């Protein structure tokens, strides 16, 4: 946020440029996490592996777009639908991005 | 052992600018003391030319042809016993290894002086008569032959 990160020898600052690398791509929508999340939205139940188990452990609601390969018993809302690429999750995400802001009232 | 550093560079002889005449003496030294060993090798090359009255240092080659080998035998037990296979020596090696058999023939040779133990065995070596040439021809009788057993 200011200039103070360009401290010490130049290879000290760069050794954190390359932390920021390894972390904001994995982590850039969660930067605070000062309380525990209340709900989840998921698009795979294979490739996303651990998240569904952590959620069902602790008792979280899970919103899940699912195909002929799925396990529907592990969720709170199935939306049966084509598994992957942009056209599928486009057709659902309008109305998600709506309800989570006009629903604040 | 991954890096190219594997041989000494040395400088040329004080007269004819040749690392040939320089590696000769630097093989012959066996006890150290260089510069008087280099003047006594310079005395070998004059006792040489007493035979012929010209640049017999050109005939240095016409002896060294017979002392240079193509092959050497090193540690190769590969095949469950001694399986040699010498392999040839790379071009740079042909005449240094010839200096090795000129100096072992000179050590007990018997000639009056050490200038003459070297200048006589070079004379013989051009005659193929030599004891430095006999050692090489032994290896040719040995491992260049054993080409046919490899």
């Amino acid at each position: 946020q200011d200039g103070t990160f360009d401290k010490l020898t130049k290879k000290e600052a760069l050794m954190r440029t390359r932390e920021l690398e390894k972390l904001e791509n994995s982590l850039g929508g969660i930067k605070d996490m000062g309380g525990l999340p209340d709900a989840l939205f998921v698009i795979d139940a294979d490739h996303e592996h651990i998240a569904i188990k952590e959620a069902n452990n602790l008792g979280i609601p899970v919103f899940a777009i699912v195909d002929t390969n799925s396990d529907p018993d592990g969720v709170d809302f199935v939306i049966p639908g084509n598994d992957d690429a942009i056209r599928a999750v486009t057709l659902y995400l309008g109305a998600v991005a709506a309800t989570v802001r006009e629903g604040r009232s | 052992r991954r890096r190219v550093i594997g041989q000494r560079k040395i400088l040329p002889d004080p007269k004819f600018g040749s690392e040939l005449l320089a590696k000769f003496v630097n093989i012959l030294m066996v006890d150290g003391k260089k510069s008087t060993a280099e003047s006594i090798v310079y005395s070998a090359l004059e006792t040489l030319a007493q035979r012929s009255g010209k640049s017999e240092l050109e005939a240095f080659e016409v002896a060294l042809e017979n002392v240079r080998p193509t092959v050497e035998v090193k540690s190769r037990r590969v095949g469950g016993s001694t399986y040699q296979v010498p392999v040839e020596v790379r071009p740079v090696r042909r005449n240094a290894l010839a200096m090795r058999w000129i100096v072992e023939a000179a050590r007990k040779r018997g000639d009056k002086s050490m200038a003459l133990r070297l200048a006589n065995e070079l004379s013989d070596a051009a005659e193929n008569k030599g004891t430095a040439v006999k050692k090489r021809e032994d290896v040719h009788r040995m491992a260049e032959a054993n080409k046919a057993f490899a």
């Binding site: - | 052992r1 991954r2 890096r3 550093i5 004080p14 260089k34 510069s35 008087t36 280099e38 003047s39």
Partner: protein, 127 residues
């Protein structure tokens, strides 16, 4: 007008001064031949100045503080190099290419404990 150097090699301790014309080599009050009279290296001190036609152009004066003749042959190399190094900047490429700039500094990562060779780390083709 004049140009100069000093050396440290096996084990001496020598200086050298370049001077105007007449082309000679004077060690304190005597000639080169009197000081290396048999000493087979002797040419190597006059060799790089005979390129640049010294005979009417330079003059070379020397003095020595622990002789050391077998090692002096390079203390003088380095020294006479520092002198020409302000005579003419052009020849730094000639002095390097001919080895005449080099000075003793290196051991080839040698023994400390037992092993012969001692910088290079464990090497494999995939361990």
């Amino acid at each position: 007008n004049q140009y100069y150097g000093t050396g440290r090699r096996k084990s001496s301790a020598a200086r050298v001064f370049i001077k105007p014309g007449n082309g000679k080599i004077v060690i304190n009050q005597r000639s080169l031949e009197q000081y290396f009279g048999r000493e087979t290296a002797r040419m190597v001190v006059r060799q790089p100045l005979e390129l640049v036609d010294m005979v009417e152009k330079l003059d070379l004066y020397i003095t020595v503080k622990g002789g050391g003749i077998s090692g002096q042959a390079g203390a003088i190399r380095h020294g006479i190099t520092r002198a020409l190094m302000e005579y003419d900047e052009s020849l730094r490429s000639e002095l390097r290419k001919a080895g005449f700039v080099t000075r003793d500094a290196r051991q080839v990562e040698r023994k400390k404990v037992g092993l012969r060779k001692a910088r290079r780390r464990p090497q494999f083709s995939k361990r």
